[PDB]
Design brief:
heterodimer; A: three-stranded mixed sheet; about 10% helix; B: nine-stranded parallel sheet; 3 helices; 9 strands; about 15% strand; binds 2-acetamido-2-deoxy-beta-D-glucopyranose; Spike protein S1 (chain A); protein binding; Severe acute respiratory syndrome coronavirus 2; Complex; dimeric
């Protein structure tokens, strides 16, 4: 009966960095996906394995809402079967994904003259991430044969950089906030339903 | 004329198996099936040889990571390639003329390898290229006019190398360049006027280089950064125009006032 806390995920003042992406578990509540989908607030609203027109008509065991910030031209990597620095090393969706990827320009909130450096991404990794894996490690990356001993140097690079969004960037370089909704139906009653 | 294992390497063969969706690498394939491959994608692989790829003529996209492969000569026949992406931490030498037939190439990506030098004119035929990325290699210098024929380049990434200097006028032909990254190198100085003809430039990264801020050597760079400060960007938290710093002082390059 209680209201699902989607206003808290979508209207939070601060979002997570994509490498430290933030998951919120939604349970035992009523949610109105239709108001979001018809709102004309989003630049990306793509769903996989389910139609967005039928979300209020279904119930689920758990909904996961993962949120973060990336560049406009990286929203394409938040989709099943994609590759690139973001999908490979920062947020990876499974091939059999069931859910929706929602995104909106946040230049007005996440861009600053001279740069916004409170948003980071991971540039290097030994191997591609597995679906829904989170890696918040800050260990020097060994791009060569020599150990690094936890100290930066040649072929020994700190693995995280800041986006540095400037408000005069082109849209593909501007910040976008992203909400990924995962719809689960495990062996339990479904306690997340649309409005009555 | 069915045949398979046209790819001696076992890891690569399974990769071709997975692409064609067959039980095993013993399964024969026709030429029609070989001509059906448009895209090969081999993440996190152990491929040691890409022999046999010379017969996939309609490949347009290739992306491959391997900590073992060091020969890439077979790829010179893929004349329909528009997207090539290679992460080979053992690639030390580029075969002579390898890209000279890949004239439809739009995006070329070579990262995490050991190339310390590039052959002369290696890119001269890729007159359609829009994007060139050569990060995390060991390049210590660039050849003269190595980019002169890429008149349609819009993005160039040379970060995370060992570049100590840049040739004269090396970017002069790149009149549509909008994004250029030189950060994380060993550059003490740039040639005078090295950026004067980049009339479409919108984003440039200059930080993490040991800039020598002695006058008059730093004059062109300090004056250029102040005139074009709207185009400077940074991946480290600093006021972006101030992100290029003098070795020793740690003062911003753009704060250095050199006489006349
Ligand atoms: C808060 O988020 C809701 C979605 O749950 C949205 O419809 C609403 O417009 C937001 N409030 C604002 C933007 O003031």
């Amino acid at each position: 009966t209680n209201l699902c806390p989607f206003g808290e995920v979508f209207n939070a003042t601060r979002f997570a960095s994509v490498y430290a992406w933030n998951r919120k578990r939604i349970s035992n509540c009523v949610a109105d996906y239709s108001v979001l989908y018809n709102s004309a607030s989003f630049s990306t609203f793509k769903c996989y394995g389910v139609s967005p027109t039928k979300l209020n008509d279904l119930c689920f065991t758990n909904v996961y809402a993962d949120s973060f910030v990336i560049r406009g031209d990286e929203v394409r990597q938040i989709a099943p079967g994609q590759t690139g620095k973001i999908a490979d090393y920062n947020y990876k969706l499974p091939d059999d994904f069931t859910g929706c990827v929602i995104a909106w320009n946040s230049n007005n909130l996440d861009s600053k003259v001279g740069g916004n450096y409170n948003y980071l991404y991971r540039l290097f990794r030994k191997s591609n991430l597995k679906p829904f894996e989170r890696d918040i490690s800050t260990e020097i990356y060994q791009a060569g044969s020599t150990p690094c001993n936890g100290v930066e140097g040649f072929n020994c690079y700190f693995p995280l950089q800041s986006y540095g969004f400037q408000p005069t960037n082109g849209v593909g370089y501007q910040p976008y906030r992203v909400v990924v909704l995962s719809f689960e139906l495990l062996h339990a009653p479904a306690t997340v339903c649309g409005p009555k | 004329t069915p045949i398979k294992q046209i790819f001696p390497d076992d890891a690569f063969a399974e990769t071709i198996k997975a692409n064609l969706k067959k039980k095993s690498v013993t399964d024969a394939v026709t030429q029609n099936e070989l001509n059906s491959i448009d895209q090969i994608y081999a993440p996190d692989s152990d491929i040691k040889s890409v022999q046999g790829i010379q017969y996939l003529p309609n490949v347009r996209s290739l992306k491959l990571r391997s900590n073992k492969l060091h020969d890439i000569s077979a790829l010179k026949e893929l004349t329909n390639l528009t997207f090539l992406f290679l992460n080979l931490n053992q690639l030390q030498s580029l075969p002579n003329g390898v890209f000279d037939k890949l004239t439809n190439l739009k995006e070329l990506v070579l990262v995490e390898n050991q190339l310390q030098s590039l052959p002369d004119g290696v890119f001269d035929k890729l007159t359609n290229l829009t994007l060139l990325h050569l990060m995390v290699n060991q390049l210590q210098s660039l050849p003269k006019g190595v980019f002169d024929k890429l008149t349609n380049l819009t993005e160039l990434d040379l970060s995370y190398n060992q570049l100590q200097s840049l040739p004269e006028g090396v970017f002069d032909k790149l009149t549509q360049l909008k994004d250029l990254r030189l950060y994380q190198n060993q550059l003490k100085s740039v040639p005078d006027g090295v950026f004067d003809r980049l009339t479409s430039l919108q984003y440039i990264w200059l930080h993490d280089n040991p800039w020598d801020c002695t006058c008059p050597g730093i004059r062109y760079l300090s004056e250029w950064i102040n005139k074009h400060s709207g185009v400077v960007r940074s991946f480290i938290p600093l006021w972006a125009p101030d992100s290029a710093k003098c070795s020793g002082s740690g003062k911003p390059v753009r704060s250095i006032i050199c006489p006349t």
